[PDB]
A paper describes a structure:
Poliovirus (PV) belongs to the Enterovirus genus of the Picornaviridae family. The PV genome, approximately 7.5 kb in length, is a single-stranded, positive-sense RNA enclosed within a capsid protein shell. The P1 is further cleaved by a viral protease to produce the capsid subunit proteins VP0, VP1, and VP3. In this study, we investigate the production, antigenicity, thermostability, immunogenicity, and structures of VLPs derived from PV serotype 2 (PV2) wildtype strain and thermally stabilized mutant (wtVLP and sVLP, respectively).
Our cryo-EM analysis revealed that the PV2 sVLP closely resembles the native mature virion in the capsid region, whereas the PV2 wtVLP adopts an expanded conformation similar to the EC or 135S particle. However, the wtVLP appears to be in an expanded state compared to the sVLP, as evidenced by the radius of the wtVLP being 170 Å and that of the sVLP being 163 Å. Structural comparison revealed that the two-fold axis channel, formed by VP2 and VP3, is markedly opened in the wtVLP, whereas it is closed in the sVLP. Detailed structural analysis shows that in the wtVLP, the pocket factor binding site is preoccupied by the side chains of Y159, F237, and N235, and the hydrophobic pocket collapsed, with its volume reducing from 914 Å3 to 577 Å3 (measured by ProteinsPlus). As a result, the wtVLP VP1 “pocket” can no longer accommodate lipids. The structural comparison showed that the wtVLP is highly similar to the PV1 135S-like particles, and the sVLP structure aligns well with the native PV2 model. Moreover, the B-factor of the sVLP is generally lower than that of the wtVLP. Collectively, the increase in the number of ordered parts of capsid proteins and lower B-factor suggest that the sVLP is more structurally stable than the wtVLP. The D-antigen content (reflected by the binding activity to the mAb 1050) in the wtVLP dropped drastically at 35 °C and was almost completely lost at 40 °C, whereas the sVLP exhibited significantly improved D-antigenic thermostability, maintaining >50% D-antigen content even at 45 °C. Next, we treated wtVLP and sVLP at 37 °C for different periods of time and then evaluated total antigen and D-antigen content. Despite the yeast-derived wtVLP also possessing a reasonable amount of D-antigen, it fails to trigger a neutralizing antibody response in vivo, likely due to its poor thermostability especially at 37 °C, the normal physiological temperature of mice and humans.
Numbering used by the authors:
A (entry chain A), D (entry chain A): 70 to 212, 232 to 287
B (entry chain B): 62 to 133, 148 to 159, 174 to 263
C (entry chain C), E (entry chain C): 5 to 180, 187 to 235
F (entry chain A): 152 to 212
């Protein structure tokens, strides 16, 4: 035992990309012009973090989210565009999910939001323990894998611009203050779905 | 008190047995009545496994206490593993049976002992929870070694499972 | 390096701000009666329950009361209340329901007060029973008698107060827990020409252990998009 | 009672968008080319904040204003424009309201003003208690709903540019040091006008 | 001046972050059994070795055991284990191997436990030898006898535990060290009609001095590109 | 404006072979994102040797 770099905090608190969000600005032309996508915060999208968390039954940790936004000009000769401003809103568990770009959910009455300006250092937010139970449940035998975690929504708040722009937002989640309980053996078969089914 | 489940028989082709708690005790007299009459509850378990094997019998049994034994509700009799109905070597969760020893466990080697005991503390994400729709603990008995015996007598070794609740708490009478 | 949270406005941000009008002569406060520190002050105030929601008795004054003396009455629940203040329409419009509509999660005990408004000469008995969570509401007097219940006497006593304890596996449950029903016990007896159409009123309030977390938006009055 | 997240400060001190201001630069071409709009600071424009404040009769709080400016090129191929500078001026109660872009009210002789540069972090100002009475009056029965609060004006101070630009300013108001008196029951009917009329 | 590390997101960065939900009522923790501080807790837990990897005995239950009584047996190693937990397939799938797969370097002693499952009346002797690192595994009983070895008796004793010491020039070696082999000593003797096909089980675990550094990614289950 | 990803590969880790392979997910490889116009990125790599000191000469196998 003993020695550093082998602790639970060292094992779990590592930054990794967990989601990619595609947003547009205006001028659909021939595309759907998706202004937002919305992503439910979960650890099932990354195999490494999923395998690390499945090693235990109950866990408690805080989530630190880092957003990196990279914009691209679809047409090289559309003209210089004004600097883009992106709105990243955290949706707490139990809150309504946005369905339209200009709906009431984007008013940030109770949903935390951060505005990111292109060229600025990447946005960073910290989400504390938002679970309903005393610890997150990776396994539930009965009638809890969906341990809330809220969701993230990113949209462009710029005005109507004739030019076409596409931006990609990389979401990095770094767990903090990780505590684990009830050790479990590692997964030995490839994952199929969000459950424990095997083939 | 001590509640004894139905006796299972060990064969030479048995792939193992599994039980769920407090699912196995839902109809076990007073404890089952209390867990049915209350919306919330909390209680520990004491697991005793008895193998009625003679000195001429060969094999080993692996008793594992798995918290939240999710499988990819029979009740008293539980169920059996499948050779190829959870898979025995996959432990019902796609995990090699060698790593199943991470859980609290006891080894019943017929050449050393014929009984084993286990202490199961209350494990859950809540201080108190319903005793009916949630399975707090699971008991899995696996044939670590194939059953063999002298060519004299007997074909089936009876196996007795006794579970006694402890630290019982009940709230929300209905 | 540009990272989220740097040079960006955050809704839940908290730093110091430049003063638009420095050295401004702010009017000193005065001891205005009714100072409130916490929103839980409003939840502990008794609020009349709209109880009898019917098509005639909706958005009116007759809904707040239930007539307590029919001709031959029945052995059925005259009124039934569900322990879902943020979900039951009979309790969503109350002060407790309005407070809970702003918070996803809630915890603590609840208090229900019932008082009937009739003549002093009216005599009778009523049965008030509390159904534990997960149990169906009683459909008869015997079923109510099988569980936790109290006997309410029509007479010198005119008000009955019951407290529903906090019974939940989790510390807080979502605002998205048992039943309270009343039954006739023997009869309602009145003297010569005494009105046989007296009425009852229900009140709901929160206890001292009430607490909420994770403030959200309200459903009532929403047009902004 | 007790427990956090239920206090008056927690209930009221939440950021939300309360106003949107449209400004132009030059070259009207075919539009009115509104260089300023001016907005009277009030809580009647947002239903959530209005409902929260109507719960009590008298209240005292300080207002923190955050301005987010997003510019847009009306024509994609007009050419690169110089970085825009916006002037945001706070008008104290009783002060004259600007009527022209180059009038005397924009000289900031006594009106606080802040200059915002495009690409910079969003501007933030704090307005203390500017009421005339000892507390704001949400109800007045006699011969006070217009509790001053001043007003905000935003204009573009850039020189004559042939290119056409349109900018939108989002105003977020976060109350601070909120104290309330004389609790009132919640509103049960949709609002019609700035009064208490119901239908 | 713009230099690397300024205004840029770093994977191994550590500063304070703005709170998305300030003054949130976080649920207090409870004493959940099985709290673990360090990943080395899992490495010290005994894990059954898949030992006999064969084409019939693969991804099944028969691989975990080796039959210990043939008809005439042989003077050859019945089973051989390599001291490469992160490289040997017989030890890569164990808990120690899975833990080591996440770390480039490792150090510390190892513990191997062998127990056989047969009848109490079975009597015999077995030879367990440890080959020093850099030495070929013995191919005969005499070669095993020439090195470090122990005599395991089949009888009242049913389990044998051996500890492999930490022998390496460097403080930590890569997870990319000797051999452990067992030999028959005299014979396996059983009484009348006693089964002559008893089985043995192997277990591997880490010692208290085990330590790893330079955490890496795992090989099992990788599809992201 | 261009964004560049600079990733440090620890010894013994796989070397990237494709732009969108698994090695760029930074599961255990430290990485820093640089934005054009920002001050130059700066990282510090401690002693990552296996022996007690770096060996500029080695006479043997």
């Amino acid at each position: 035992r003993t020695r550093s770099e082998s602790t639970v905090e060292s094992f779990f608190a590592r930054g990794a990309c967990v989601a990619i969000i595609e947003v547009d600005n205006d001028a659909p032309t021939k595309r759907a012009s998706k202004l937002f996508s919305v992503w439910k915060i979960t650890y099932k999208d990354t195999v490494q973090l999923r395998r690390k968390l499945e090693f235990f039954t109950y866990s408690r940790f805080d989530m630190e989210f880092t957003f990196v936004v990279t914009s691209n000009y679809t047409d090289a000769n559309n003209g210089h565009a004004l600097n883009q401003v992106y709105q990243i809103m955290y949706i707490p568990p139990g809150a309504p999910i946005p369905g339209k770009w200009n709906d009431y959910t984007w008013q940030t009455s109770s949903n935390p939001s951060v505005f990111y300006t292109y060229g600025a250092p990447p946005a960073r937010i910290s989400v504390p323990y938002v679970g309903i139970a005393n610890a997150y449940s990776h396994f539930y035998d009965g009638f809890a894998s969906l341990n809330d975690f809220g969701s993230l929504a990113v949209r462009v708040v710029n005005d109507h611009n004739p030019t076409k722009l596409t931006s990609k937002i990389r979401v990095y989640m770094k767990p903090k203050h990780v505590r684990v309980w009830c050790p479990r053996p590692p997964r030995a078969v490839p994952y199929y779905g969000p459950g424990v089914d095997y083939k | 008190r001590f509640y004894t489940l139905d006796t299972v028989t060990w064969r030479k082709e048995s792939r193992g047995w599994w039980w769920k708690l407090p699912d196995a005790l839902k109809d076990m007299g007073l404890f089952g009545q209390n867990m049915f009459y209350h919306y919330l509850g909390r209680a520990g378990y004491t697991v005793h496994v008895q193998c009625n094997a003679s000195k001429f019998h060969q094999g080993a049994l692996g008793v594992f206490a798995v918290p939240e034994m999710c499988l990819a509700n029979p009740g008293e009799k539980g169920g059996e593993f499948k050779g190829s109905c959870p898979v025995d070597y996959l432990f019902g969760s796609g995990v090699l049976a060698g790593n199943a020893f991470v859980y609290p466990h006891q080894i019943i080697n017929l050449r050393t002992n014929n009984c084993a005991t286990l202490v199961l503390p209350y494990v859950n994400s809540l201080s108190i929870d319903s005793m009916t729709k949630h399975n707090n603990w699971g008991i899995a008995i696996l044939p670590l070694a194939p059953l063999d015996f002298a060519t004299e007598s007997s074909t089936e070794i009876p196996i007795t499972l006794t579970i006694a609740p402890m630290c019982c708490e009940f709230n929300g009478l209905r | 390096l540009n990272t989220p949270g740097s040079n960006q406005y955050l809704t839940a941000d908290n730093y110091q701000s430049p003063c638009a009008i420095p050295e401004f002569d702010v009017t000193p406060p005065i001891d205005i009666p009714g100072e409130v520190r916490n929103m839980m002050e409003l939840a502990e105030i008794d609020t009349m329950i709209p109880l009898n929601l019917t098509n005639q008795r909706k958005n009116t004054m007759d809904m707040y009361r239930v007539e307590l003396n029919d001709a031959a009455h029945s052995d059925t629940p005259i009124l039934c209340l569900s322990l879902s203040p943020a979900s039951d329409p009979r309790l969503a419009h109350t002060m407790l329901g309005e407070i809970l509509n702003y918070y996803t999660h809630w915890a603590g005990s609840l208090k229900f007060t019932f008082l009937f408004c009739g003549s002093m000469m009216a005599t009778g008995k009523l049965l008030v029973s509390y159904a534990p969570p997960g149990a169906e509401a009683p459909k008869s007097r015997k079923e109510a008698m099988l569980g936790t219940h109290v006997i309410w006497d029509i007479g010198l006593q005119s008000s009955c107060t019951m407290v529903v304890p906090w019974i939940s596996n989790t510390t807080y449950r979502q605002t998205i827990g048992g039943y309270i029903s009343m039954f006739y016990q023997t009869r309602v007896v009145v003297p010569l020409s005494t009105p046989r159409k007296m009425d009852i009123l229900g009140f709901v309030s929160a206890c001292n252990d009430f607490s909420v977390r994770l403030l959200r938006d309200t459903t009532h009055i929403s047009q902004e998009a």
